[PDB]
Amino acid sequence: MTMYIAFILSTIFVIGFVGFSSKPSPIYGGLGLIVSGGVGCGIVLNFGGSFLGLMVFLIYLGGMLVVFGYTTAMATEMYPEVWVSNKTVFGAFVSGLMMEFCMVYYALKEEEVEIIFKFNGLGDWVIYDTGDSGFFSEEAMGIAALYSYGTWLVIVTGWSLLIGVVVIMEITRGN
Amino acid sequence: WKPPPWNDVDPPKDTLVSNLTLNFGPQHPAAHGVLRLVMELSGEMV
Amino acid sequence: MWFEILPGIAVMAACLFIPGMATAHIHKFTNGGKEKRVAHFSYQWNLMERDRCISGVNRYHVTKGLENID
Amino acid sequence: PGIVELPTLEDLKVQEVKVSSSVLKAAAHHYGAQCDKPNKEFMLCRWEEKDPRRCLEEGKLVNQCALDFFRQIKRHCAEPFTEYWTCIDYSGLQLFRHCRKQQAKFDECVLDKL
Amino acid sequence: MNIMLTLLTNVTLASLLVLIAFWLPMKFFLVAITFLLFDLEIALLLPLPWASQTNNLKTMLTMALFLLILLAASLAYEWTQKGLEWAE
Amino acid sequence: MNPIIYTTLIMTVMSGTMLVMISSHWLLIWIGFEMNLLAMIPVLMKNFNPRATEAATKYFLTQATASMMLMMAIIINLLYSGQWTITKMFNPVAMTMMTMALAMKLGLSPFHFWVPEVTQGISLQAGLLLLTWQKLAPLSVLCQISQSINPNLMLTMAMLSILIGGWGGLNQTQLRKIMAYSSIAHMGWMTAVLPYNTTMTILNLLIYITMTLAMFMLLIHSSATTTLSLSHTWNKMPVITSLMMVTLLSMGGLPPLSGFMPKWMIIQEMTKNESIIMPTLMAMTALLNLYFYMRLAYSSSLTMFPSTNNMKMKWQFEHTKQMKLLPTMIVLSTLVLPMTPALSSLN
Amino acid sequence: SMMKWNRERRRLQIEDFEARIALMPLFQAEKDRRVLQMLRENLEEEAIIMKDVPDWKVGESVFHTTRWVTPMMGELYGLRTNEEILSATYGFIWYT
Amino acid sequence: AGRIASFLKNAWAKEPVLVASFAIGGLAIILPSLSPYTNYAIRINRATPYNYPVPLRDDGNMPDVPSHPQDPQGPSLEWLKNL
Amino acid sequence: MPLVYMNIIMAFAIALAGLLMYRSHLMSSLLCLEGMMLSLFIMSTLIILNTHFTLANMMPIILLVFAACEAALGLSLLVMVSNTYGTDYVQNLNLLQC
Amino acid sequence: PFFDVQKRLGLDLDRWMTIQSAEQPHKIPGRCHAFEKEWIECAHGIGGIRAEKECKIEFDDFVECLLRQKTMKRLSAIKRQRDKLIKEGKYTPPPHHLG
Amino acid sequence: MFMINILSLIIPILLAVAFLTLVERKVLGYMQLRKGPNVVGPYGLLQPIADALKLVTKEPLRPGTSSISMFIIAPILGLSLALTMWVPLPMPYPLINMNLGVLFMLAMSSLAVYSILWSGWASNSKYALIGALRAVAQTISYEVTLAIILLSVLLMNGSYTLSTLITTQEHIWMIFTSWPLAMMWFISTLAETNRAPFDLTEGESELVSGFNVEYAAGPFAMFFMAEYANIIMMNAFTAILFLGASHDPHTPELYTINFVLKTLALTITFLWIRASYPRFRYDQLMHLLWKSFLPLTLALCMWHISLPIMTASIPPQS
Ligand SMILES: CCCCCCCCCCCCCCCCCC(=O)OC[C@H](COP(=O)([O-])OCC[N+](C)(C)C)OC(=O)CCCCCCCCCCCCCCCCC
Ligand SMILES: CCCCCCCCCCCCCCCCCC(=O)OC[C@H](COP(=O)(O)OCCN)OC(=O)CCCCCCCCCCCCCCCCC
């Protein structure tokens, strides 16, 4: 429909995870996460969070995952398994299908799913709050505090990234 | 289970190189024509 | 000569002209000779619903002014 | 635990100001400057009581004084207003920057006429 | 909605005109990992425009410039210890 | 490595745990755990040998996965209380989630198969860092949230460490493997007492830390990684083997050595908590540790072992490294039992 | 040149923000009545729908406090048709 | 001195991009400190009413706060007007 | 509680199962570990944006910039076992049997 | 903190964002700021074990604001018993329900 | 309503992309002293039609080593991306007024590299695979400078709203304020768009065709048109960024004339720049980027963040 669009996207998000959790060929597994990464931003986008969502596209989907499949490109064997290949991969995929079907069926009929966390099965929209945000975006004005309140965060995350640059050379140096 | 190496150095395996011998020449105007070249390289270094 | 590339250039200017006038004129047609009221923050949004709900015809673009109140 | 008290629909019925956004924003400066005390009373009540149902009466006066403000300007140069708020409407962001001459037209009644 | 409609229409147009064209007729790793670390460090200062309008921008000045010198510092250590001069 | 570049990697991880013990915010605790992992990997691969490459991979995958499991434990607690501060957890499954997540970072229960392999691959100098400093960071969080801990959840983790540490230690040959299993067995002792009173948890940590440095740096001086290789050191350096024996007895736990420091108070502490069957099993199964301590003690100094002719050449040259803090570490791990009432300082 | 122009834009924004400050009294008063008027229409409908159900105190308080909690949209719109729900919740987000 | 000047000259001889980068980065770190408009930037930054000026309960004894918005009492951004 | 969160919560669980179970390739395991922090990112943003916890918007950006540091380390280790063993299959990584 | 250098040095590194009722950019509320103010202000100087007992009512409300479990569960009873009345024709919607 | 605007945007974009092949062969020739396509069609007005029709009537070859699943998603992933990237362009009043449009444009620009990456894997040839491998690594290395240039430029502009570009750039072109970054930006456009001195893949002899090594007529239409499609826009993005025009609300015609002429002139320089320079060797790309372009961009971002603070010139995001 359109009311369940976040639910619809969330459903594609779960099945997208089964795509790469089943551990298919690394390129194909990356693609299964690429769509999973794509829809997940839309879930965030529907809740607001434009900037936080946009990063999932930019620095993760077009970022971390680009060099991810890039490594799989020059590595890996000469015979990449096609999604069907090993019967376990398709067995894992159908296995992921039966988990999301049983809960969703249970979610939309009895609405009293208690698996681990007790969760009531209503539409996505019955959780949004109310109120006007004035002239400032809540997400934009929050992470803009990186340089006004994010004092100890910047000092530590910056320092580790510099150590991140030095650790990667030291491991890749080859002594 | 064999005892671990005393120097802790496990024995190297054989070569794992990917020095593909590119066949330049009779497909690329880059070779100006009939200039079949046989040469190996470390991905980029001939 | 050199101007033989001009008709190749001119047709492009006609093609790129279409998006500029369309998305402007369509805005004028869908807003009633106006532009689409941008909503970059919450205030610009509930302002429209304020105007959309008062119009009675459920359109934000149609505006009722001093002739409406007494 | 217990019933949540909600004001009845009878006193809730209040004359709602039937004007658009452009007319409100065009005269917002003068509207805020002149009829402001009832707004401040309601504004303080909303932040102090923290309960909307306590200050609903002051909300009526906020509208009520708004009609008085719009009534006085209606008797005054309404035609310059129609010119002023129409050009303000023709702005996507309702920027006051574009409308200057018509803004001056409105400003030069209220300084002496009103 | 409009955003979804726009992207959906683009996919169909690409799909439609693809179909008519089908039925009718360590160095390599290092450049990847160095980009990854720089790109992640880049995402830190993306919120800079709105952050430039904070009410204590003096502290912003010390720390927004902090990340930028670390960007230089990470490259500087990379450059001096070979690094960007990739294996050849 | 370049001495200045190995220095910062050594003490970026020093700071990574330092953040954990001082952070009052849940995210910051994960931050210190991240720098803990990010600086641990290069040190494990200082020598660049396939054992180290395997050891780093096994260590990284285990610690990274535990870190990820820790995050959703943080998120669930946030999802149910909206509190980022470190206090008692406000939801059961979140409490159950991090206990296992923090356990895998430390490694006591079946999440312990990485501990032997990783230290076996990596060098002895990096072994002490992994087995001593890399245990304060997970333990600091556990001591912090001990109030909300699930008593059943932790204690079964505690025995499964000491029973596994006790049992498998008999069959181990490589000294690093034996040291790792004793570390697992020692890890169980303070984790068991953690729900009751964290003072003994810290007390067991400090003593165990002191004993392990005395063990590792002496082995570094011996330059030996196998029992037979350690056996030869009787002739060249008889004094070291004699000190090897006293710390083995100490770290065995026999009185009046400092190994009776943690157990006795731990035995006493749980006995005040009406848990009396629990201490007896741990004290009795602690003898499994003592057996391969005895096995090492027999082959090191108590009975001399055959040597080689070439090691007459070894006598002709003196040692070079000054093995800093070795003298004070040994004495602080053997004859500190009469200073038992000093445990009141920790609380 | 850009320094002078940017300073003018800041002058324009604070002028625009000032216009918002004047307009928010009426808007807050308008939304104040609207949000609780809709809540009452829920309450009157609530009485007619669960009069038959055995155990239900009409208008039962959700929170233990007697202080006015901000009413989330779920109880506000709720009963409204899916058109009203769709346009009001994901309205800002999908407006473009 | 002489070697330092020669060091810069040969730096500009073969490596002109980096000396341009270091010079610009070198400046860009120290004028914001001794800038005379930095305080102005803060002043106009706080002089942007994102949040409503919530009124205060008039209990007397406070003359600085204006009784009327147009009243002379209270802060003014006349400085922002000409600059 | 909204089904979108349970959709995310299983998304961790199915990602968790894939990371633990293993099939052949460490690339897939590294991929599975990324779905871990991914599903954590949407879950973090979803709660934080819903509750208007303004300062807490810190954590989503901070979360993945440090999770990506795992990729910087995890990807590097793979190529080394790829350089020495050949294929990065987990079965190859068995030298530390003792 | 295990080593509360935060308190000794008197300088803030992490407690700024620890709670949503703390200082916020441009003074915007954290949705449930009102409730968690009551709970925290109930719990100060009381101790962890005590506060979970006496300040339970405040915590239950604050969770209901934050978690919002039962409020929409009751709203579920509103809708489920609604469509289980219209489907047999026992209920008719007034015209303010639609427009 | 909305849909008629969608075709009114993408369709003229697509038809302009087909014609750009003509000028590529013509204005180069008129500089190369050649004549360019002239015989077919009056003044070569019909050559792109002849070009496009055989590509949609020639045999579409699927090499046996190519995965058909990967062989078909990639051309769609490329062409569609170029078209949906046009939706936030501020043509008087943009079709999509995404307040994060600058990030929106950049985000799917990174999504473009999956088009080449998958095609290089799909083709599955030794020479083809390395050709794409050392092609993607180029594009990703050029995005870091791309983001930094963007970040500095809109810092003086204001928020990331693409419509705000025309407001900040009211009296003076933004290039007069960031000309050291303009050429920094322009060369970056020359590299992501895969054009000489970064043609690399699509180089007629550099990689014979690079991403089109085994990839011929049929599906190849959506893989040699997409690169040319990004050319018109990424120059147009430069036109909005540094060469912004004036927009009268009562006559949006002026800004349509000005912007289209400005972006068309930039594309002429883009076609000018292929016919005047050699091709960078792979090492020279990184040497130019990481060691000269990357440090300079960082320094300029150092300068452009302090300057608004230096002169109290912070821009209003709203
Ligand atoms: C108060 C003032 C504040 C600001 C002051 C800033 C400093 C002063 C100004 C410095 C110059 C401007 C910034 C740097 C620009 C050069 C960057 C660089 O790396 O240069 C050297 C680089 C590299 O030169 P190189 O490789 O020979 O040497 C570099 C140094 N070593 C050897 C040590 C590495 O040159 C280039 O990149 C050449 C261009 C390559 C692309 C080919 C196409 C060029 C097309 C040119 C014509 C069209 C231009 C269109 C412009 C945009 C129009 C919209
Ligand atoms: C708690 C229970 C007991 C626990 C500990 C038990 C320890 C022994 C257990 C068995 C150990 C294994 C079997 C024996 C191993 C022997 C190890 C060894 O190295 O033996 C040979 C070695 C030869 O001696 P050498 O190193 O040459 O030094 C001689 C002195 N210069 O010998 C040595 O190196 C030993 C040197 C010993 C030096 C002793 C010095 C004594 C000083 C006394 C000072 C008194 C001051 C009094 C002051 C009074 C007023 C205050």
Q: Tell me, using a 6 A CB cutoff, whether residue F301 lines ligand 2.
A: yes
To 10 degrees, what angle do helices H16-28 and H2-14 make? Answer: 120
- Total length of chain K: 318
G33 CA: distance to closest CA in chain J (Å): 16
| Helix, strand, coil content of chain A in percent (nearest 5) | 70, 0, 30
* Residue G50 DSSP one-character state: S
G28 close contact with K: CB closer than 8 A: no
Fill in the amino acid letter for F19.
L
Q: Which two tokens stand for residue K232?
A: 């018109």
* Residue F239 DSSP one-character state: H
D10 Cβ partners below 8 Å, 6+ apart?
Answer: none
Tell me if A59 and E39 make a contact (CB, 8 A cut-off).
yes
Looking at CATH, the fold of the domain delimited by E1-81 is given as: Methane Monooxygenase Hydroxylase; Chain G, domain 1 (1.20.58)
Instruction: Give the CA count within 13 Å in the CB-facing half-sphere of F234.
Output: 18
State which ligand 1 atom lies nearest to the alpha carbon of K175. Answer: 54
Q: Which two tokens stand for residue K301?
A: 């971002």
DSSP per-residue codes, A26-84: HHHHHHHHHHHHHHHHHHHHHTS-HHHHHHIIIIIIIIIHHHHHHHHHHSS-SSPPPSS
Question: Experimentally, how was this structure solved?
Answer: cryo-EM
Distance (angstroms) between ligand 1 centre and the Cα of E29 equals: 28
Q: How many CB pairs under 8 A join A and K?
A: 62
Nearest to G30 among D3, D16, D43 (CB): D16
- Our separate counts of H helices and E strands in chain G read 4, 0
For residue K72, the tally of other CB atoms under 10 A from its CB is: 18
- Give G2-7's long-range contacts (Cβ < 8 A, gap of 24+): G2/K156, G2/K168, G2/K172, G2/K174, G2/K177, G2/K313, G3/K311, G3/K313, G5/K168, G5/K170, G5/K171, G5/K172, G6/K156, G6/K168, G6/K308, G6/K313, G6/K314, G6/K315, G7/H83, G7/K312, G7/K313
Q: Tell me, using a 6 A CB cutoff, whether residue F100 lines ligand 2.
A: no
Domain boundaries, given as residue ranges, for chain E: 1-81
B30 torsion bin: left (phi>0), alpha (psi -120 to 50), beta (else)? alpha
For residue H7, the tally of other CB atoms under 10 A from its CB is: 10
Q: Which two tokens stand for residue I63?
A: 């979360």
C19 Cβ partners below 8 Å, 6+ apart?
Answer: K8, K9, K12, K13, K86, K89, K91, K95
* Residue C70 DSSP one-character state: -
A132 close contact with C: CB closer than 8 A: yes
For residue H76, the tally of other CB atoms under 10 A from its CB is: 10
Best CA proximity match to I41, nearest among F231, A13, E58, D100: A13
Residue range I3-92 in CATH 2.60.120.10:
no
A14 Cβ partners below 8 Å, 6+ apart?
Answer: A96, A100, I7, I10, I11, I14
- Give the whole-angstrom CA distance, residue F181 versus residue I89: 28
Helix (H, G, I), strand (E, B) or coil at F297: helix
The distance between the two most distant Cα atoms of chain I, rounded to a whole number of Å, is 53
ω into K308 cis (within 30 of 0):
no
HEC string for F61-107: HHHHHHHHHHHHHHHHHHHHHCCCECCCCCCHHHHHHHHHHHHHHHC
Residue whose CA is at the smallest distance from ligand 2 atom 33: F239
Tell me if D46 and G61 make a contact (CB, 8 A cut-off).
no
Nearest to G10 among K98, K171, K316 (CB): K316
- Give the whole-angstrom CA distance, residue C43 versus residue G31: 13
CA Rg value for chain E: 22
CB I69 within 8 A of CB F38: yes
Best CA proximity match to B3, nearest among G70, I98, K20: I98
Tokens 């600058």 found at: K102
Best CA proximity match to K88, nearest among K169, K156, K161: K161
- Give the whole-angstrom CA distance, residue D89 versus residue D96: 10
Helix (H, G, I), strand (E, B) or coil at K13: helix
To 10 degrees, what angle do helices J33-43 and J56-66 make? Answer: 160
HEC string for K112-131: CHHHHHHHHHHHCCHHHHHH
Phi then psi for residue K62, to 5 deg, are: -115, 100
Q: Which two tokens stand for residue A140?
A: 């934009």
State which ligand 2 atom lies nearest to the alpha carbon of F239. Answer: 19
- Total length of chain E: 88
Q: How many CB pairs under 8 A join E and G?
A: 5
- Give G27-32's long-range contacts (Cβ < 8 A, gap of 24+): G27/C46, G27/C50, G28/D42, G28/D43, G28/D46, G29/D42, G29/D58, G29/D59, G29/D62, G29/D63, G30/C50, G30/D16, G30/D17, G30/D63, G31/A132, G31/C46, G32/D46, G32/D52, G32/D55, G32/D56, G32/D59
Chain J neighbors of F87, CB-CB under 8 A: 48
Q: Which residues sit with their C-beta closer than 6 Å to ligand 1?
A: H 15, 17, 20, 24; K 180, 182-184, 186-187, 197, 242, 273, 277, 288, 291-293, 296, 303
Kindly tell me the burial class for residue E63, based on how many C-beta atoms sit within 10 Å of its own C-beta (0-12, 13-18, 19 or more).
buried
Tell me if K84 and E6 make a contact (CB, 8 A cut-off).
yes
Distance (angstroms) between ligand 1 centre and the Cα of K271 equals: 20
Looking at CATH, the fold of the domain delimited by A5-173 is given as: Four Helix Bundle (Hemerythrin (Met), subunit A) (1.20.120)
Judging contact as 3 or more Cβ pairs under 8 Å, the answer for G and K is: yes
Helix (H, G, I), strand (E, B) or coil at K87: coil
- Give the whole-angstrom CA distance, residue G23 versus residue D10: 26
Measuring CA to CA, how many Å separate I38 from each of A34, B37, F252, G49, I68? 11, 48, 46, 44, 10
Chain I neighbors of F30, CB-CB under 8 A: 66
- Give the whole-angstrom CA distance, residue A157 versus residue F30: 11
Fill in the amino acid letter for F126.
A
Tell me which ligand sits closest to the C-alpha of residue K181.
1
H or E segment and range at residue B39 = strand B37-40
Residue whose CA is at the smallest distance from ligand 1 atom 37: K288
**Residues of chain I with a CB closer than 8 angstroms to some CB in chain J:** 1, 50-56, 58
D109 close contact with C: CB closer than 8 A: no
Kindly tell me the burial class for residue F295, based on how many C-beta atoms sit within 10 Å of its own C-beta (0-12, 13-18, 19 or more).
middle
Question: Where in chain K does DSSP place strands (E)?
Answer: none
Instruction: Give the CA count within 13 Å in the CB-facing half-sphere of F241.
Output: 23
DSSP per-residue codes, chain D: --BPP---HHHH--PPP---HHHHHHTHHHHHHHS-HHHHHHHHHHHHH--GGGGHHHHHHHHHHHHHHHHHHHHS-HHHHHHHHHHHHTSTT--TTT--HHHHHHHHHHTTT-
Kindly tell me the burial class for residue F229, based on how many C-beta atoms sit within 10 Å of its own C-beta (0-12, 13-18, 19 or more).
middle
- With CA atoms as reference, the chain H residue closest to G13 would be H48
Q: Enumerate the β-bridge partners of residue F25.
A: F85
Touching G: J residues 30-69, CB under 8 Å = 34-35, 38, 57, 60-61, 64-65, 68
- Give J75-83's long-range contacts (Cβ < 8 A, gap of 24+): J75/A122, J75/A126, J75/G74, J75/G75, J75/G78, J76/A111, J76/A120, J76/A122, J77/G50, J78/G46, J78/G49, J78/G50, J78/G78, J78/G79, J79/G78, J79/G79, J80/A111, J81/G49, J81/G50, J81/G53, J82/G49, J82/G79
- Give the whole-angstrom CA distance, residue I53 versus residue J25: 11
J82 close contact with G: CB closer than 8 A: yes
- Give the whole-angstrom CA distance, residue D19 versus residue C65: 5
CB H25 within 8 A of CB K296: no
Best CA proximity match to F40, nearest among F111, F140, F114: F114
- Give the whole-angstrom CA distance, residue F10 versus residue F25: 25
Residue whose CA is at the smallest distance from ligand 1 atom 9: K180
ω into H32 cis (within 30 of 0):
no
Helix (H, G, I), strand (E, B) or coil at F170: coil
Angle at K123 between CA K119 and CA K129, to 5 degrees: 80
Tell me if I61 and E44 make a contact (CB, 8 A cut-off).
yes
To 10 degrees, what angle do helices E27-44 and I58-85 make? Answer: 170
State which ligand 1 atom lies nearest to the alpha carbon of K187. Answer: 41
Tell me which ligand sits closest to the C-alpha of residue K180.
1
G17 CA: distance to closest CA in chain H (Å): 6
Domain boundaries, given as residue ranges, for chain I: 3-92
Measuring CA to CA, how many Å separate A45 from each of A6, K70, K318? 9, 29, 21
State which ligand 1 atom lies nearest to the alpha carbon of H14. Answer: 33
- Give the whole-angstrom CA distance, residue D85 versus residue D74: 14
Q: Tell me, using a 6 A CB cutoff, whether residue F153 lines ligand 2.
A: no
Burial call G22-42: b when 16+ CB within 10 Å, e when fewer: bbbbbbbbbbbbebbbbbbbb
Tell me if J19 and F28 make a contact (CB, 8 A cut-off).
no
H or E segment and range at residue A112 = strand A112-113
- Give the whole-angstrom CA distance, residue K113 versus residue K134: 12
G7 Cβ partners below 8 Å, 6+ apart?
Answer: H83, K312, K313
- Give the whole-angstrom CA distance, residue F244 versus residue F179: 13
Measuring CA to CA, how many Å separate D77 from each of D70, D109, K40? 11, 7, 67
